[PDB]
Amino acid sequence: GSHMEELQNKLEDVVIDRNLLILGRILGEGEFGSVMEGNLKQEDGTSLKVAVKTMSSQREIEEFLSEAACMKDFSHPNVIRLLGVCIEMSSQGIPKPMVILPFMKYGDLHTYLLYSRLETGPRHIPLQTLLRFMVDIALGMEYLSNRNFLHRDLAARNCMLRDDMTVCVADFGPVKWIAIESLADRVYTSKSDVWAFGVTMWEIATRGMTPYPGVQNHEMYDYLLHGHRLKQPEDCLDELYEIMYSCWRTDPLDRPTFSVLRLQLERLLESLP
Numbered sequence: 125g126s127h128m129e130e131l132q133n134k135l136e137d138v139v140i141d142r143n144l145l146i147l148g149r150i151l152g153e154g155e156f157g158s159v160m161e162g163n164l165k166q167e168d169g170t171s172l173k174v175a176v177k178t179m180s181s182q183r184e185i186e187e188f189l190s191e192a193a194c195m196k197d198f199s200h201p202n203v204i205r206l207l208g209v210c211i212e213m214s215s216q217g218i219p220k221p222m223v224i225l226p227f228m229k230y231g232d233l234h235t236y237l238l239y240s241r242l243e244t245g246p247r248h249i250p251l252q253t254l255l256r257f258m259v260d261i262a263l264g265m266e267y268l269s270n271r272n273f274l275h276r277d278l279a280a281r282n283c284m285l286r287d288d289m290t291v292c293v294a295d296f297g298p299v300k301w302i303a304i305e306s307l308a309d310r311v312y313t314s315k316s317d318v319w320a321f322g323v324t325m326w327e328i329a330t331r332g333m334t335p336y337p338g339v340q341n342h343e344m345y346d347y348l349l350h351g352h353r354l355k356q357p358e359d360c361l362d363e364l365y366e367i368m369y370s371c372w373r374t375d376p377l378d379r380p381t382f383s384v385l386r387l388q389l390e391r392l393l394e395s396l397p
């Protein structure tokens with residue numbers, strides 16, 4: 125059919141030949157995987173510097189390729205573009221899937237904010253620029269919400285800064301970013317992503333503070349249950365705080381959409397001198 129034809133087209137696009145990729149040094153290395161430098165040889169002869177994220181039955185491999193094929197299709201300047209996938213195999217017979225991404229030398233937004241409070245790192249980020257990060261994230265999420273794609277792990281550490289200082293959402297799926305209903309019922313909608321966006325806005329306005337100082341992760345459900353939310357950052361605009369506070373309304377139906385949030389943020393940014 126057409127649904128099957130559309131899937132088969134996407135699956136053709138996503139896979140990269142292993143010989144077109146050259147691996148470099150290890151950048152990061154945790155439990156779930158490793159991030160590495162790479163070179164990707166392109167159609168025009170020249171090479172491109174890339175980031176390579178390396179991630180066990182073939183059902184999960186087909187599921188990975190299917191999911192990768194969907195993400196490959198995203199095209200928006202505030203959503204990270206998946207360049208493609210490679211599947212290398214181990215000596216034991218376990219497949220190692222690899223995800224190829226544009227290299228972003230400025231790194232993740234959370235680290236950038238924290239560095240901005242240190243002498244050697246980037247200089248003090250003014251209110252206009254912090255709000256521009258929030259607008260950029262809202263635009264990326266508005267795009268994903270229109271395609272009925274849930275991010276699931278939205279946070280400042282999963283937003284990446286491009287060379288022009290544009291922010292894009294990345295690292296698609298952290299107790300303190302999860303909505304109250306998603307902790308209770310184990311269910312996740314676009315309004316759960318909106319909650320996470322509010323928490324991400326708070327990270328940006330505090331220049332990288334961990335959410336809910338003095339509240340443990342195991343204490344989080346009961347804390348939210350009694351109506352408590354993230355406190356207004358020092359020297360935060362009342363209008364900005366009202367926007368992020370609207371993201372944490374108890375009833376998910378009362379939370380605004382990403383399009384509504386994005387307009388409110390652009391208007392607030394335009395009003396600043």
Ligand SMILES: Cc1cc(-c2cnn(C)c2C)ccc1-c1nnc(N(C)Cc2ccc3nccn3c2)o1
Nearest residue numbers: 159175177188191192223225226227228294295296
């Ligand atoms: C988009 C994306 C998708 C998947 C995924 C999960 N399941 N399937 C099927 C896929 C295709 C996994 C990871 C990502 C991703 N997004 N961002 C990053 N990283 C590693 C952050 C990064 C990016 C760029 C960068 N440059 C220097 C350092 N950097 C660090 O990883």
Ligand SMILES: [Cl-]
Nearest residue numbers: 203204205226
């Ligand atoms: Cl990108």
Ligand SMILES: [Cl-]
Nearest residue numbers: 227228286287
């Ligand atoms: Cl870039």
Ligand SMILES: [Cl-]
Nearest residue numbers: 331332333334
């Ligand atoms: Cl801090």
Ligand SMILES: [Cl-]
Nearest residue numbers: 336337354355
């Ligand atoms: Cl708080």
